[PDB]
């Protein structure tokens, strides 16, 4: 049922997603990671686009 709901993008999935996202960092990485500052962790902000 959860998979179906996410598959149809129910109205509540965006609240569940804003709660999953909150303190969960994500690693952003460009292609030629020359120095270690090329993989940096950010906290995500659910943006439209």
């Amino acid at each position: 049922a959860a998979k179906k709901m996410v598959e149809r993008e129910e109205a509540v999935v965006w609240d569940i997603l804003d709660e999953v996202i909150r303190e969960h960092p994500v690693l952003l990485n460009r292609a030629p990671t020359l120095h270690r500052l090329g993989i940096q962790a950010f906290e995500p902000v659910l943006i439209e686009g």
Binding site: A11, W14, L46, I47, E48
Partner: protein, 219 residues
């Protein structure tokens, strides 16, 4: 309905306890953040009536550059200190105060002669420092009603800080009603000289703004 706009339901105002408020009002319509915040900013800054020391005549000084016997704060620092003076006057319109006092310590605002018209919101406010001697100070301050801000270059003279506000700055933020992601979260933020707290200066500005619109508001 083709006329049904979101009205902010998160008007939660934080404040630093006396005179610095910060109102995170949300959610505006898309694009209504900058219109509302900028209308209020212009109104508070440019036309927000209040009383302020308009001029000062010192009992022993003619020019704007001089020194008095016993004061190290020169006359321009004295005029600056007078500019910060936060007066609120009653029904009287153009009030004049006398500031004759002698001694050695700081010359606080509480050294002003009383009256039933004028009230100083910070008696602890300094006006001038004095020598360690018989040196005295005296002067006729002229507080006068006014609306916005009028510098001396337009008009001794002292720049008239009529309006109460000292800093307004709004940062339209991102908001989110359920599915929509593009909205406006207007974060107003103000401080005042003290004559009125910010969460009321804002409502007086909004009053002045809406009553100018009353000639077209079709109920």
């Amino acid at each position: 309905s083709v006329t049904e706009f979101l009205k902010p339901r998160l008007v939660d105002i934080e404040q630093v306890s006396s005179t610095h408020a910060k109102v995170t009002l949300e959610p505006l319509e898309r694009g209504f953040g900058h219109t509302l915040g900028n209308a209020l900013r212009r109104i508070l800054l440019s036309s927000m009536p209040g009383c302020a020391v308009t001029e000062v005549e010192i009992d022993g000084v003619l020019h704007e550059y001089s020194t008095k016997e016993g004061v190290q704060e020169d006359i321009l620092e004295i005029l600056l200190n007078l500019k910060g003076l936060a007066v609120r006057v009653q029904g009287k319109d153009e009030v004049i105060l006398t500031l004759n006092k002698s001694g050695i310590g700081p010359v606080t605002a509480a050294d002003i002669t009383h009256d039933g018209d004028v009230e100083i919101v910070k008696p602890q406010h300094v006006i001038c420092h004095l020598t360690d001697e018989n040196a005295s100070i005296s002067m006729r301050i002229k507080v006068q009603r006014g609306r916005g801000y009028v510098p001396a270059s337009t008009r001794l003279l002292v720049d008239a800080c009529y309006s109460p506000v000292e800093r307004i700055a709004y940062n339209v933020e991102a908001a989110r009603v359920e599915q929509r992601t593009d909205l406006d979260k207007l974060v107003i933020e103000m401080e005042t000289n003290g004559t009125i707290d910010p969460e009321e200066a804002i409502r007086r500005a909004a009053t002045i703004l809406a009553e100018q619109l009353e000639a077209f508001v079709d109920l």
